[PDB]
Amino acid sequence: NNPLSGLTHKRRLSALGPGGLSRERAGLEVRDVHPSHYGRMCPIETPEGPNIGLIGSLSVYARVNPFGFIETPYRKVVDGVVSDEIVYLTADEEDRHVVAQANSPIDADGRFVEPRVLVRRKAGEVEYVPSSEVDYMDVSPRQMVSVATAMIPFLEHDDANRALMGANMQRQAVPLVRSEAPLVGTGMELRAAIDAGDVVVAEESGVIEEVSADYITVMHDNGTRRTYRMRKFARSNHGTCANQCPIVDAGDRVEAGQVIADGPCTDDGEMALGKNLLVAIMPWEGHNYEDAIILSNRLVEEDVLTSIHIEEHEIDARDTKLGAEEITRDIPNISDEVLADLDE
Amino acid sequence: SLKVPHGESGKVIGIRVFSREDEDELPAGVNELVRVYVAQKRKISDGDKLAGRHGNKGVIGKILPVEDMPFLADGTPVDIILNTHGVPRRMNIGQILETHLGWCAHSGWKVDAAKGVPDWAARLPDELLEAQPNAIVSTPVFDGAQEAELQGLLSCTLPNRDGDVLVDADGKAMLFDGRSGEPFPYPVTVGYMYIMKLHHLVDDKIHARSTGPYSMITQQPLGGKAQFGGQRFGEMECWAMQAYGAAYTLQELLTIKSDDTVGRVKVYEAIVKGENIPEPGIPESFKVLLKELQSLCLNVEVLSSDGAAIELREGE
């Protein structure tokens, strides 16, 4: 549907299958947020129907053991001072240590300001112990969320049930003919578009030699020349349009890793799934009663929300026990008025 | 001949032909392949689903002319109207904060430091003390803009072409009524919000049928929208008919609209000729059930008021 859904599909942890569970046998205790999910699974992004809790998403900083156990990083603290040495811990090793909280006041030298801090003890127990006995600390406040949940501004002000829908509905957006980036963002939108892979990046450094609507030619410093082609109006798995456009000039200098061409839901390298509109919060004559919405006509006369959908049809010509089917313009059953748009 | 299905249209943008004689891989038994691509451009309309990043979700009820829309003091119409009754009871107040910050980012601001940095802006960086119109900002997921900062920025925004500030320190503005002309009596919240278009469009969900293809074993209408099928009248929908007392509607819905093969044609002829609708016959699924029961070595028969089993096969 769009790059975000493709990236999210490849990061899914599924509890069903030949060797796991069943949608009918699974009860209510395998669909709960265990205290050991902190940093390994996202507690918010999950389906809304009969598969609630049976499908989840990996967190941003998580990684897998050579055995199959998910790890997560921490910062080691000694003598009340936070160091900068990162150690990856599995859920079976972090229950013997006191782990602090990401939102903790830290001075210039690295000592806690508050006398007592909120920690996590052995059995996922929350306590208020003082800043002299902790042994580890979190790496960032977004350690426990996935790639689509980390794209909601002001998430800490929203309930879990509504944030669940907000994360689920970002994967159902359609590409529009023109894209524009949010006025208010989060900063995850730049590396969520490069890693998805629907843009074109440069594999070496050089200057741009020729630019057209379907190819870019880059001359490297050593002498080699590389050309990149574009997919113009390609059909995706869901009938949407996947179009790539160049965003460079004819004399620019390009560094390795720079974004060279845009994509379906991209605006200058960052993901853009919607548009910025001027809002009013008020009832109006009952036309927005019970979750309805009133729009303006400037959004139809100016192509603000317009999308292109492509379809595909096939047919086959084969042999028969009575002969062989043939594709031809000559049909002795129908008139000549409906055979005017056919070629030779 | 390959024809366009029901309710489709659009230009033709590509043809890919595969042949056997020109050394192309093909399934055995076929001689030529061809694919046709058809594209269309879809605008926004009633029934289409919109959404935000916080859980807001609804379909479009009306589209209004730009002269029928509430407008600001300089004549700027608004683009979308959302209701206020759904916010407090669902505990998603991030959307209002987003609209406030979006207005501040769109208009641009500047913090005065003639007598030193104000007390509320002590922890702000030095590059966030001034911004240009149509600026882009970033508020991380669990460490972002506080409420003292938003409240202080809402009173620093720049004016427009004429030296006017339309939105006051609370984020509220006075709007005019585009149908009657009088101002609205109380200030209203205004701002900018990020709206996405969801892939649930009304053009792919409308369907209707009078008659069409039928099944083979049980001669009921086919199912689905691609095959021009009918709508199921399930078990729970029969209980409502039986609780209303409607004995004729249910009988017509169950015999001459689903299974009565001989009554289906006569009903159509009666409707076309303008006469009275005939009397229902007997459904085919009952006969299929009886022939199913007889194959398990069960001697099931339909008797009359004095024995003498009825044939139940027509044919005469």
């Binding site: 941003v60 900083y61 720079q258 | 966030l128 970033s138 508020t139 460490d143």
Partner: peptide, 21 residues
């Protein structure tokens, strides 16, 4: 940041990060 050519998006964050995703 950390990408050669990227739009300049100013941030409200008050914490620093010792690791990259």
């Amino acid at each position: 940041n950390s990408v050669p050519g990227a739009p300049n998006r100013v941030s409200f964050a008050k914490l620093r990060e010792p690791l990259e995703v």
